[PDB]
Design an enzyme around this catalytic site. Structure first.
Site, PDB file in Angstrom:
ATOM      1  CD  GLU A  14      -2.700   1.086   2.515  1.00 44.28           C
ATOM      2  OE1 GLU A  14      -2.087   0.965   3.619  1.00 44.28           O
ATOM      3  OE2 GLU A  14      -3.949   1.177   2.543  1.00 44.28           O
TER       4      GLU A  14
ATOM      5  CD  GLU B   1      -5.562   6.385   4.614  1.00 43.57           C
ATOM      6  OE1 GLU B   1      -5.272   5.785   3.552  1.00 43.57           O
ATOM      7  OE2 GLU B   1      -4.984   6.154   5.686  1.00 43.57           O
TER       8      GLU B   1
END
Length: 185
Positions: free
Chosen positions: A78, A172
């Site tokens: 990620e 995010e």
């Protein structure tokens, strides 16, 4: 470039009001959340892509990132290029720095345990980060020349996977509220 992927995910905590806007545009308005990631970009990422954006609103109230975001498989990684943030600047194992698009970025690795990934709800995996040393101003057109980051990461033994998953310019957040509005191309 036109975007072909819309990312809108919440771990269910709190409220995430994400709007899939015209073309490359989107907005997020979130309230008392757990984890969420919203953004636009591409089904298939590449280390050779140039990503442009303009964040017309960047108003986190607490912990949120304005960040390039994506995955590889083989191995599962990620990764982030964080251009701005809220109250929390994400850090980890310091690797070095990279200059790209007018900014200097610290490079970090971290590890997530028992966390959501593209291959399961409870996965352990490595995260790669470039985090700008100071917040990028928002509201003007910005570019992330991603190859500069991938090359710097490689030079520090940070190897991405061979099998590229999605790649978006994202908001995010975790444990926060806020508002963002971003156009991607």
């Amino acid at each position: 470039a036109s975007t072909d992927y819309w990312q809108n995910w919440t771990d269910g905590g709190g409220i995430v009001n994400a709007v899939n806007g015209s073309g490359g545009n989107y907005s997020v308005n979130w309230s008392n959340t757990g984890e969420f990631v919203v953004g636009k970009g591409w089904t298939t990422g590449s280390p050779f892509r140039t990503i442009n954006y303009n964040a017309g609103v960047w108003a986190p109230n607490g912990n949120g990132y304005l960040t390039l975001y994506g995955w590889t498989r083989s191995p599962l990684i990620e990764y982030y290029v964080v251009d701005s943030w809220g109250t929390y600047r994400p850090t980890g194992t310091y690797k070095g720095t990279v200059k790209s698009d007018g900014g200097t970025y610290d490079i970090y690795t971290t590890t997530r345990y028992n966390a959501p990934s593209i291959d399961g709800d409870r996965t352990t995996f490595t995260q790669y980060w470039s985090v700008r040393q100071s917040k990028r101003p928002t509201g003007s057109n910005a570019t992330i020349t991603f190859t500069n980051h991938v090359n710097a990461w490689k030079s520090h033994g940070m190897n991405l996977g061979s099998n590229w998953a999605y790649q978006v310019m994202a908001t995010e957040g975790y444990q926060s509220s806020g508002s963002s509005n971003v156009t991607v191309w």
